[PDB]
């Protein structure tokens, strides 16, 4: 049978134009009152995954 | 349905193969089951017999061996040559075996 897309990956992550893997930064889902504005602001950006853990995730999205 | 026999008791046949190749003889018996014939004076074997009321003193008797039917060919009672057999429909309209060299009946 043809493979199935891992949906929890599809909902968290994106394969960029060159095949990098990008995600929202972790750590401001909550507990934010005592964090700086610098913490919050930076954590609002996307980041790029380390080569190994990124290569694993692309395999779970084989029809993107 | 039934075994095909191009030869029957007792038309005359040439043995065209084996140790008796070229001999001519009458078809003594046809054994469709084994697909073999018995040709008079051909394929003689020596069989031993026990001393009995049939054969007291005993010793041996001579017997004709069965020959594979393919090894035998009917001779045309018209032209006198060994031939393959054809069939022909008459007016009856029964069918008969006929010589392929000339149109002879083979019965």
């Amino acid at each position: 049978p043809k493979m199935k897309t891992h949906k929890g990956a599809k909902k968290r992550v994106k394969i960029t134009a060159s095949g990098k893997v990008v995600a929202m930064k972790t750590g401001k889902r909550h507990l934010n009152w005592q964090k700086s504005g610098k913490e919050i602001r930076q954590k609002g950006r996307k980041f790029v995954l380390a080569k190994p853990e990124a290569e694993r995730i692309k395999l779970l999205l084989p029809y993107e | 349905m039934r075994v095909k026999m191009h030869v029957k008791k007792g038309d005359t046949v040439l043995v065209a193969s084996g140790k008796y190749k070229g001999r001519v003889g009458k078809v003594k018996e046809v054994l469709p089951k084994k697909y073999a014939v018995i040709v008079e004076g051909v394929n003689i074997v020596k069989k031993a017999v026990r001393v009995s009321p049939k054969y007291p003193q005993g010793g041996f008797i001579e017997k004709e061996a069965p020959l594979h039917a393919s090894k035998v060919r009917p001779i045309c009672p018209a032209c006198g040559k060994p031939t393959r057999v054809r069939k022909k429909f008459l007016e009856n309209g029964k069918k008969i075996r006929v010589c392929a060299k000339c149109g002879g009946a083979l019965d």
Partner: protein
Amino acid sequence: MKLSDLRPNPGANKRRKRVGRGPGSGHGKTATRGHKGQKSRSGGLKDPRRFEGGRSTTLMRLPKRGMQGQVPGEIKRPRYQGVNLKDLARFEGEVTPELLVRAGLLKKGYRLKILGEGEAKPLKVVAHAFSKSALEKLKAAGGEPVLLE
């Protein structure tokens, strides 16, 4: 040339790797699997693309993002595929979505929107949308933009 002269090129048909076939093969006994452990077993390990030995996975510690949508699912709206001016240089006269369907430039059931990479060529091109730069370039180059809905 005859049948016995038919050959694959060198490299075209390669032999398979056969394990578990004697000492001298270099693949004997354990069949390149090492000693013991889950991996050596028939059935092997859990999907290494995801599983990490029981700790929360890399993937599952990242936050989800954006609209995923609800039943009854996708909302049917008109879709736009862009095609560049440079892609249009091959044609003469008039170009319309169906033409660029045939030439295998635009995918079916998609609305044409002309974009600006390349040059403009004095064509009468008919689309559902143009980019600002494609509009200028094409008007400037003696072409004739034609708008559909």
